[PDB]
Amino acid sequence: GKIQDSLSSTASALGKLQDVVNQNAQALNTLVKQLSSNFGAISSVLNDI
Amino acid sequence: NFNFNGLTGTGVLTESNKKFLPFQQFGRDIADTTDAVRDPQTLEILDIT
Numbered sequence: 001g002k003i004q005d006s007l008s009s010t011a012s013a014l015g016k017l018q019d020v021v022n023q024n025a026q027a028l029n030t031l032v033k034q035l036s037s038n039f040g041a042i043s044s045v046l047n048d049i
Numbered sequence: 050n051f052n053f054n055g056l057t058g059t060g061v062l063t064e065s066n067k068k069f070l071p072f073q074q075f076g077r078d079i080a081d082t083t084d085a086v087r088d089p090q091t092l093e094i095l096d097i098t
């Protein structure tokens with residue numbers, strides 16, 4: 001019965017799962033934002049090119 | 050396909066409950082992707098999906 005209260009009080013007891021989820025979300029977001037990069041192109045928008 | 054004040058993109062326009070500021074035209078999410086745009090004529094938020 002004490003472990004339930006310990007988990008409720010603590011916030012980082014779920015470090016592994018939260019860290020994995022955050023890492024995956026950060027990787028996906030970085031991949032999404034990388035489209036804005038032009039990689040030396042005059043513009044990063046296909047229509048503009 | 051939509052061209053809102055020079056912003057080119059493709060999606061489905063739908064009414065958006067959220068309201069933009071008087072001076073804010075476009076709208077982007079965390080991923081830096083256009084999520085909604087204000088009509089330059091009706092001044093109404095149109096969710097882009």
Ligand SMILES: *[C@@H]1O[C@H](CO)[C@@H](O)[C@H](O)[C@H]1NC(C)=O
Pocket residue numbers: 089090091
């Ligand atoms: C543009 O004109 C229409 C009617 O002619 C009006 O309803 C609308 O509010 C106008 N938009 C702006 C931004 O003045």
